[PDB]
Subunit: 330 residues, 3 copies
Amino acid sequence: AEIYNKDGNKLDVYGKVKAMHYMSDNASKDGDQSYIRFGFKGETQINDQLTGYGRWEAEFAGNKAESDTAQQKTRLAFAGLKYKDLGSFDYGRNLGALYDVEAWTDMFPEFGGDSSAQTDNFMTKRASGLATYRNTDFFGVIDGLNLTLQYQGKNENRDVKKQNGDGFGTSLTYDFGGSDFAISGAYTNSDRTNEQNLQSRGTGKRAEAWATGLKYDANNIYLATFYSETRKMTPITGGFANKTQNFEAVAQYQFDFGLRPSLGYVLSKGKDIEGIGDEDLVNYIDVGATYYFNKNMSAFVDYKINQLDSDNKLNINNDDIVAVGMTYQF
Amino acid sequence: AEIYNKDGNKLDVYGKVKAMHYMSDNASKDGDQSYIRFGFKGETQINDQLTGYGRWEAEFAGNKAESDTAQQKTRLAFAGLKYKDLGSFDYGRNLGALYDVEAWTDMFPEFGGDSSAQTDNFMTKRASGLATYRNTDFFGVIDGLNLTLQYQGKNENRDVKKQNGDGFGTSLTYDFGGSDFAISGAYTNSDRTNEQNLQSRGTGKRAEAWATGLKYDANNIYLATFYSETRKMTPITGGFANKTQNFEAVAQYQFDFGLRPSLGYVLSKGKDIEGIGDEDLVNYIDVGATYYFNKNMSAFVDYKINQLDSDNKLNINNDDIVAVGMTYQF
Amino acid sequence: AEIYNKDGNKLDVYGKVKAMHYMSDNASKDGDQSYIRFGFKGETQINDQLTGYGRWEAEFAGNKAESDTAQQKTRLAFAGLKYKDLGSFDYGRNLGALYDVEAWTDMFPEFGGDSSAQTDNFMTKRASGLATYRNTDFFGVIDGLNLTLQYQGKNENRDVKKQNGDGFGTSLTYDFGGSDFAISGAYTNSDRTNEQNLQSRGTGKRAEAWATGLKYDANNIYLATFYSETRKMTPITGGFANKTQNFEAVAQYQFDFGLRPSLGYVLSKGKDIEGIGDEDLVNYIDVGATYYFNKNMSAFVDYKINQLDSDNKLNINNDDIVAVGMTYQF
């Protein structure tokens, strides 16, 4: 909600209470997982052609006792400039380049974005240390095309899963539509940090990933799907997976009254693992729906139908989960 | 302060800096205990008869070095709907059912709400995992009556004091007044979680509590009092108290100029403790006052006169405390 | 940004995303150190002569993984009253008295305020437990003079570096100007806490500090400088420094277009250290500049030229650092 629009500055305070319960056995555990979001975002307008902005998004736990003050964590912190027509540059906590792809099917009521996309995993989902250029429609009219170059500074304070060396990411998108249609691909080659190569699995030199996505979003239908492959990036109980192939798909329909059913499927498949062969990393069908009471209030049910087996060589968790909830947001 | 009231949505950003000092010896320790509160709350109006809301309240420490980033904790997170006349349903971090009672005398400048009401202690004070129905005036005119049914999902991540199994809570309230008068009672039976019954004290099967309160709030006087009993819920240095009886009372007068004296007394009495017999759990007189400069600014002094003895079988703390402070709030 | 100015109350929500990168070796480390600030501040007006306020400022990390929820910390929490002409009293997390001095040259793009001023170091920089009276222009016209008396309650929960006993602080400032001119001095004598005197270095009885500053801020030039001395307050790897002498200087020029170069130098010199003699504690030249796009958006480069030696008896860090960034703020 735009709480300030004065003298060339627009403050926008946003947020969401997601009261939310998981009923299930202990895969991604069960019981309450409600949370609150909070964020501002400014846009100061320097000149009629230039603009600057900062965005901040934190996330505060809903489910802990108040004695567990290990409760908030930030999601987005950046601030940058955008010139009329030349595009936008920014730095700070942001979204890697491959997620320009993987977002196409990250629309479930709750589950999903679960495959190749780990958070604080080099440029795959959210990420620290990112300079980002994004050009749009291409300088002089390839209208529709959209471009991103990004650099990520090394991050080796953190846990060994969470670390990375200096790297790079592109992606592009061309849109069209009598109604609406788009295709997308991205590229990452971030080298791996030294301390990480003292590990059991996926040891090596560089860490790449690439993806491709097709979407269709028109006259209330939404469909999207993408493939992705990673070489030594995805974290594995042994150590980072040598390779993986991941596939996501999504079909959703929004009724006029408010109901919005979603179907989607998530597969992540471990490959050439350094002592276990190939076990799958993620395999479930998602069935669910939210009901949009309006822009602000909503309620949902989601059902992860884990499709993974019991004899699972990486001793993962074959347990279904059913999330139910209402989401107020302003 | 209602910072947004547009297109059927009212954002209300609130908060309070309580700069506050305890002078005392080390019972609930001494020195600074100032804190800050911050919360929004929305109310989107779907239709002329329905409404939805979310409330969030965190609490950020005032007193630590900045090197002790163990500093914030959330108090309320929920979001729900309310239909004209049928009442309100919500889920998330909220207030148990017995606190519909114990609030009657939780009005001191600082101390109190200290008896049967522990925070993250099954539905006794604040609490995680709560679905809550509250009906008011009873559907068709018992005007004055007010009703609450609540369910609390199991919470066993947390510390053993802090855990609980699935449970239930009712309370009701009928109001009246030529000026103002009300009576209240509530009920809880949450079963105890398995890991908790590996304890020394108050082991068992179910954990109940019940309370009763009378209040009088009219032409500037305010008086209220309540009894409460718990079976294996209140945390004890040995382990949860087998039973307890707790009594609170409060007399307060608000002058026209701004001064508001308060008298109150708090007694919590351990019963059938599993190795110590019965020691009291809380016994103090509270004398104090706030001066309301206005809606926003205020200042106070409170004085807990601990009435507990020295030879205290549960080795509690007989030490007085005197809190002084000013409270800005918006 | 003043988001509320109604019925005698002005809420002011502020904040800043400082996306920011250090390139360097590991002195104050290297890579991302962007952060976000957030604060409100109220001012309720009781009567035409009196006013009350609260200020709160937290600071949330930009650079950690979201798995390291050790991320926010508060900077300012207080709330007080100010009477027309008699001055202002407040309590809570605030700025000691010596910092009324040391602020004169704490203006770099990033570095500086680094000498005698440690945060949560008795009244030297930010600080917990502070009652503060500040009188201004002196009751009856010494216009220009400005006065501060402050008391700091003991703080012994915290780490031994971070602790302190009860203490006191004055400072005064007289301003003038055909353009602008001022001189300042402050005094602290906080006794040291008992647990702290079980240390190797700077053991003793009382902890004093004093400072002096001259500034010149006119027709776009800004120059300022100050001396400071501490007896057993500044933390040393062995233990608190017995004495120190610290000197800061700053020359800055603001062009009409927006560029604002800064020169400054920081020296902190350990004296009579209890096993090491005298090594310097801080010695660097700072060269840098911010470009102010406007009130809100800006970008900078700073360069700490560490001037400290390698054979450094307190095994400190002779490594340069170069900070680059943009700052959005509202």
